[PDB]
Design a protein around this ligand. Sequence first.
Ligand SMILES: Cc1ncc(COP(=O)(O)O)c(C(O)O)c1O
Ligand SMILES: Cc1ncc(COP(=O)(O)O)c(C(O)O)c1O
Ligand SMILES: [Mg+2]
Lengths: 389, 390
Amino acid sequence: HMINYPLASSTWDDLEYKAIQSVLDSKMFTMGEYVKQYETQFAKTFGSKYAVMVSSGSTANLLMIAALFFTKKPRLKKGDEIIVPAVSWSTTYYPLQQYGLRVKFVDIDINTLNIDIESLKEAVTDSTKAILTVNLLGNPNNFDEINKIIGGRDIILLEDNCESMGATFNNKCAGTFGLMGTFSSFYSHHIATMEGGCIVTDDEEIYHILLCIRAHGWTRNLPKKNKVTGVKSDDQFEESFKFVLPGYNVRPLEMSGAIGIEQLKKLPRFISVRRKNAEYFLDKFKDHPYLDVQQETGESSWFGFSFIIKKDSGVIRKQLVENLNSAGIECRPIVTGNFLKNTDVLKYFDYTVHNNVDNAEYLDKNGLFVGNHQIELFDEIDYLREVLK
Amino acid sequence: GHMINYPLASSTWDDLEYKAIQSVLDSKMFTMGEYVKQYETQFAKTFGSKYAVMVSSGSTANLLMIAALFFTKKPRLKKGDEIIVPAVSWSTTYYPLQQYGLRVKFVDIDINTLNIDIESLKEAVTDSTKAILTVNLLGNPNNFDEINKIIGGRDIILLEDNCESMGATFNNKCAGTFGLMGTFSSFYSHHIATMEGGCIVTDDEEIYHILLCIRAHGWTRNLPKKNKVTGVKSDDQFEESFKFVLPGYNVRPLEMSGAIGIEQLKKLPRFISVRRKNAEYFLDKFKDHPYLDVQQETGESSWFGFSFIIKKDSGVIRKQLVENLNSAGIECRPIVTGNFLKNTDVLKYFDYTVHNNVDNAEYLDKNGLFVGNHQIELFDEIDYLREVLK
Ligand SMILES: Cc1ncc(COP(=O)(O)O)c(C(O)O)c1O
Ligand SMILES: Cc1ncc(COP(=O)(O)O)c(C(O)O)c1O
Ligand SMILES: [Mg+2]
C-alpha cells in the first residue's frame, strides 16, 4: 500500500546539514568537542546535573543497569528484584537479563498505557530492589503516586524515557525523576541524531562510572579527581593505559553530537507542534464510538497516537488495520504489545508475573498506533477521523 | 598543532570517502541499510568468508561474538565454561568473557612474536578447555597450524580477535577466517577507518543469523524468511515485525560507516602493500639493533605498528627511551595495554586463573614500546628513528 500519512518524518533542516559539514571540515570524527557540548546543553535543557551521550537509547539502557553494579557500595546484585511494566521496547528488558536480575512484571493501566498503579502497590515488597518505569508514547508516569508507594524506602527508581523526551509532570522533566533516566535520538524520535541515546543523572559517582564504562573501562575521560579511581596518576604512559571497570565501547559519533546541538535548540518548537496536534486529535476523537485514546498524565510529549478498540465493540483489529493501510495511513502495534508473549526470549530470563497481565493482553490484540509529528497534521487528523468512522 | 616528526596515526581518507559521505546525505537514509549490506558483502568476499556482519565497533564485534555462542540451538558455551586467552590484548577482548560468566584462563605470550606462547598453550589446554580466543597482535598472525595441532581434534572452539591484523595471512589464508568467528575494527587509525566500526566474519549460517538478530533488538526484521533462529517467518507483518526471540542489543553501525567502508576496502590492498614495504625497510635497519628486539614475523604480517622490547641486561631504561623519542618529535605508546594482569581492580570482577606464570607479559610491560606504521611510505621517518635510537 501507498503511504501518505507515515509514522515517521525528518526533523532536520539546513542547520543540521551545516553541522555535519563543520564536523567534516574539522576532520575529527571521534567522540569529542561537540559531544561534550551536547551533553552540557542536554543536562541544562532537562534540568539534570549530568548527561552522558551513548550510541543508542538501547545502549543507554545497558549502561544504566550496569552502572549500578559498580558503585563503591554496589546498588545492585545478581538475583535482585526489579519491577517493570509488561509493555515496552525489548531493550528495556534485555539488560536486566544480561545482568542476572530477577524480573517482576506488572500489568499496565489500560487508559494511561503506563504501569498500573494499583497493581504496583501490591507488587512492591521487601524484596523489591528497584523499579524500572517507562514513560510510554510521550506520557509520563504519575511519579507522585509512585513515590507514595516507595514511601522513602531504599528502592531505586529508574526511567526509560526513550519515547517521552520533553514530557513533564509537576513541572519537572520526565527522565529526571529517577536515579537515572534514558533517552533516545534515533530516527524519528522527538529529536534525531541518526542513532543516539543519553543517560541523565544527578549523582556524581554514577556519572563518573558512566564515563568509564562507555569507553573501554579506561580512565581517559575521567577528571584527575574522580569517584572511580580517586586521583589519576600523572604518568600517561601508565595512566592512559589503565582499565578499571568491565565496560564497553558504546561511544557516539562526533557527528551525532553536532546534530544534537541543532536539534535541542528546536525542541521547544517540536514539543509545541506535537502538543497542538494532540489537542486537535483529542478533540476529534473525544467521543469515538469504538476507539479509546490515551489518557494524559501531566504534559505528554505525544510521541504518537494510540487507539484501543472498545470492549464489546465487536470491532476487529485486522479490519481496521487493513482499512487504515488501504487509505494510505501507516500504522503499527502499540510498541511491542504484550511483551510476555515472547516465550522464546523469556526462556532466558529469571522472571515472574505479578498477578496477571490482562490489560497488556487486551492491548496486544486490540491496540494500534498512528504517527504524531513535529509538523501540523490537522488535515491528516481530519482524514483519519473520516476513515475511522 | 602537534610539532610531530613521526606520528602514531594518520588519516586513510581521500576525496573518495568524502564523496561517499555526500552520497548518503543526499539519500537522506541514515540508518543501517543498503550501504552497510554492500559493505558486508564486499567484506566477506575480500577475506574469503561466507558471511560478514558490520557492528558499531570492534568492541561490540567481540561482544556479539561471545554472545552468539550462548544462543545456538545446541548452546556452544555456557556459564562457567573455560576459555583461554593471552595475557596481552585490548581491554575489550576480555570484558565480554566476564560479562558472560566464563571462566578465564590467561596464558603468557611469546616474547618474540608477541602472540600466545605455543609451548605454554600446549600445557594450558585440558579437557575442561571449551574455547581458545586468539588475538593476532600488531598485524602478526598466530601460527594456526600449531594451534590446530594442539586442539588435536578435540572439541574446542577457536576464536579470533583480528582487530589489529586486518589483511594478515597465514599459509595463504586470511587472519580472522581461521576461527569459528573472527573480529575486526575499522576505528580511526586501523588498517581501514570508518570513524568507528567493527565486523564479524563467519562461515557458519546459524551463527550468521544469530548475529543478525542480536545486533538489532533481538528481532526478526533482518532475518531471511527461512532462517536458523526462527525457522520460518510469518507473513503477518503487524505480527512478525514486533517479535523478539533472542536477548540482544542495538549495536548497529551507521549507514555512513558502511559507505565509507566500501571505499576503504578498495584501497586496502595498496595500504597493506605500503605497510609491508615500510616494514621490510624497518627490519633492515633494526634487525641488528644493539639493545632492541623487534617483532618476529609469522606468515605475512599486516604490520599495524612497530614494537620494540629492550634487550635483557642492556642497561637501557624504558623511561629514558620514551623521553628521548618525545623530545625528538616521535610518538610512542606501550604495546597495546602491556600486561593486562596488572589491572587488579578490574580483575576483581573476573572468574579467572593464570596458567603457570606471565613472565613474558611482565617483561614486555616494563620493557616494551611501539611506534606507528602507516599506509604512506616512512623511509625518512624510519631513518630518523634509527638515528634517535642510537
Ligand atoms: C522504550 C524504549 N526503550 C529503548 C529504545 C531504544 O532506543 P534505540 O532505538 O535508540 O536503541 C526504544 C526505541 O523506541 O526503540 C524504546 O521505545
Ligand atoms: C585487540 C583489540 N580488540 C578490540 C579492539 C577494539 O576495537 P574498537 O576500538 O573499534 O572498539 C581493539 C582496538 O585496537 O582498540 C583491539 O586492538
Ligand atoms: Mg618520504
